[model samples]
Target chain A: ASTENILGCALDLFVKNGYRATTIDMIAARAGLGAIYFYFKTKDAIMLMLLEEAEKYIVDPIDEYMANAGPLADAKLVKFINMQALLGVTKPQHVLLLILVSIDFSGTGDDIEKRAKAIYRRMYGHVEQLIAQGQTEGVFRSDSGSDELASIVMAAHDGVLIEWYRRPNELTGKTLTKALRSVLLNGLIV
Target chain B: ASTENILGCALDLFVKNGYRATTIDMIAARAGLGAIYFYFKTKDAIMLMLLEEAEKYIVDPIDEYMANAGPLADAKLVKFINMQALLGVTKPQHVLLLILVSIDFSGTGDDIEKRAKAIYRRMYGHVEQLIAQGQTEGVFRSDSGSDELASIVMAAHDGVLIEWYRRPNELTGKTLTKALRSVLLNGLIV
Candidate 1:
């Protein structure tokens, strides 16, 4: 977990200041490393490291959990997503997430498109998988396309994050998880 | 218009720098005042001022418009409610709405809470009216209580914002609006 210690220190500073605002020197200082360049080489390298770590564990776990775990598969999926939302409440990922809001369609040649698309596809795939499973298992309605439904849910989920960016204080509630779940799994008409 | 200049200035700064990052001095600087103290006196005062402006004119106009326009009687209510989903995208008010989600509840005091409650209640009331109109007109089902349904949808909207805040540069289209509108108007069933 030494790598995690590095990530932990890096994430702490990243959340505290910001990706742009926080210096590699500060992160190196926190991790007790000898030199900033010795560790990350560049600030972008540091972020790439974190994203890699998050994707390695955070993104994959939920998918595996959903795929393997039974009985309460949908329930497990909801809880899993809720955990991310909940972690966002107090974690440095919250700030990392907030800063991410403005990264834009094509940054000044930052390679964000490749990274962003990867992240988007991973999440959308999960949501779509859940939808497909729900329909096959008779838990979700079989009316809509799982991919489209997941896309809408992911979009809204992304929008909720924007709302939090706008006003982190007022966006509280498990309803975020519940509401998005209902819409994709449930549909809106009543 | 005097008040609008204050709000207009506040809105731009708040959108750009966020609430805590935006100081009264900065606002006054933008407003061309010698000192902000001569006018609003306190930071919270400016917030109160903006809230009042949003409630009085910004939100009211939308409510009035929804009341007068849309499909009418029965068919109107669903379109009206879904249309309401797009309200968060308007200009300065959307920014105001964004700030609402980001407000640090810990930062406010008793009087501010009271004022905030009044505004929140007013919003709740508006949604209630719309829900009732929908139910009576047969456009929306009356199974769910107006308050609960309204609160749920409201939370979903914020949830979308929270997600959007997490990854601003990555999302687009009506993904969120479509998701919330789909759930609120439809419910989560196969």
Candidate 2:
């Protein structure tokens, strides 16, 4: 019941819809409960409860990704792209991150926000590290602003998440990674 | 008085709190009115009104840029990037285009979405035109896939919008266009 009603409903509402709109009554109704305060006391408490549940969802793959990922540049590039697509699909809420930033949801005082940022930074770091490796291996050409390219990549990934979301069922983790990889590997002009 | 009251309060609620949180009652109360029914009615009406009045504030530049802007690529890349920066600062709702897109707000029996898509496509067409120029002019070294390269550049501009929104005081259109130009003129690698 906890997984099906509470966590499941919260994930759908919070992830698919925005937190501000997911009212207590909606959560209770979705979870088949009488009142949200009957269990979770505050809106923030539900967010925390959702966060803890989401944490396991976030961590399980990250741990596996780093451990099993290869150390070579080509391998690493593939892995990074693979990881981006994988993460975007299973946890679509993360893409709302860019939307939230556009609207400044970071200052809303939710600890979950900080955790999301931390998790995202780790992901960016891993990709940037792969970029650094690519330079050493002579796959990606470098610039004085090499780090900026990584930022560019992250930004594009986030931006496309919004674009890809429009395509609905057309974009996938693998397809997204491939789309990004195509340009990064192939060059856009001729 | 009805439209004025509804929009005035809605702007604050949408910006300060969030659109999802801001309600018709809150809008009515803040506007010193008892009923939103006195307005055009419906949430869609509110959005339409928002886009209508808000659209003007964004328009003078769009018109100015379309007029005073170049008809060619090499002559236009500089101004193009600058215009995007101007939009970021002056008209942030443009960034929300991504969100509207994710939610399929475009094809929802709205004429404005058609115009929006056409405008973006026309802008993108110029970039593609420039890629061809780069080839003939012998300045760009892309061997194939100019269309894909155009998409990448599009992605870069979209990417920069997010960064600009995040750190407006620090990020500028010039800086972003410069980054894009650098990558286009050369390429991103180690």
Candidate 3:
């Protein structure tokens, strides 16, 4: 009960404020508890726990989507990208936390980053396989390896999504979605 | 003399240790100064000044590159992308700062972000015009707007470069450079 409450409050604090500004005092107070020392050993421990929760939140939905990605998975994947971009508008915290955990800091734990990168590779693998499958059919070109194309796709998404979050005016989710799909597919298709 | 030494020490500290772990005292002590606050108001102010310096170091070169780029600038621009990738492996600090400044903070001063974004737009506008010029010459496709394509290019670079920074073995500068140019230009060119 305490752990759940702690994590919930910690996430909210980290998201609303930021990780550096957020401390055990904020988390425990937000959780309506006294001194979270009994629940977690250190701040890094709490952050690692939060990282685990964050991983589950992001990866599970995509897991379900990938499990049942139909014949139009390529298109569906683009929809997933769009959905995440739109979600960034409302739930910017999740994306922000994930990227922060994965990229922004050098202070975080090593195993934590290893785990985060592992979750990332799962997503990257799924996309790479999709491109390879498309090539097996007559959908995509076989000249560029699925790995390279997958990297390009992921990079494009990461690049624009972060920038759009920083400055909301430059590119909308709708336009970015169209541009990504058109550019990627146009290059890949024979 | 003091400010230069202060900034020089500050950059090394920030780059070597990280923004989170770095302290004003560390910078001041390193600079052999008794007080840093005497010179700069806050850590963010020091960082903002560093941001300005970093911008000049990077943007100035690229500005020169753009100025000299003539009729074949589009093709030459691809080589420049390749060059920057190779530069990343040896000196990751400059690119790292630009990226970190723009994307990695919710706590930074708004004016700093505004300034960073403006510098970003200058680079983006330069590339956008390059693509637009290519389109006019019938060297590139007119399907996507120059602005969108340019965004894609910048995004692709950001994505791959960040990953490469994190794990050099996972992807190489050469491989990513080739993938970015190939994927973007393939989709773009006539």
- Provide fnat values for all models in the order shown: 0.28, 0.25, 0.38
lDDT of predicted model 1: 0.55
Candidate 1 CAPRI assessment class:
incorrect
Candidate 1 runs further than 4 Å off: A1-6, A25-34, A71-109, A136-138, A159-190, B1-60, B66-81, B84-179
Candidate 3's residue-wise lDDT over A20-106, tens digit each?
Answer: 667888787779974689779877788788766656666567756765665654555565666566655555555555655565344
TM-score of 2: 0.68
Query: Which 10-residue window of candidate 1 chain B scores lowest in summed lDDT?
Result: B98-107
| DockQ, Cα level, model 2 | 0.27
Which tens-of-lDDT digit does each residue in B1-190 have in candidate 2? 6667677677555544455555677777788873787565765567556655544554334545644555544445556556665666665554444334224322222344444444455555566766666667654445554554555566667766655544456556445555555554444543
Q: After superposition, how far is residue B79 of candidate 2 from its true place, in Å?
A: 5.3
Candidate 2 CAPRI level = acceptable
lDDT of each: 0.55, 0.56, 0.68
Candidate 2 or 1, higher TM-score: 2
Candidate 3: the clashing residue pairs are none
Report the lDDT of model 3 for residue A39.
79
Task: In angstroms, give how far residue B3 of model 2 lies from its true place.
Answer: 9.9
Candidate 2 chain B, poorest ten consecutive residues by summed lDDT: B101-110
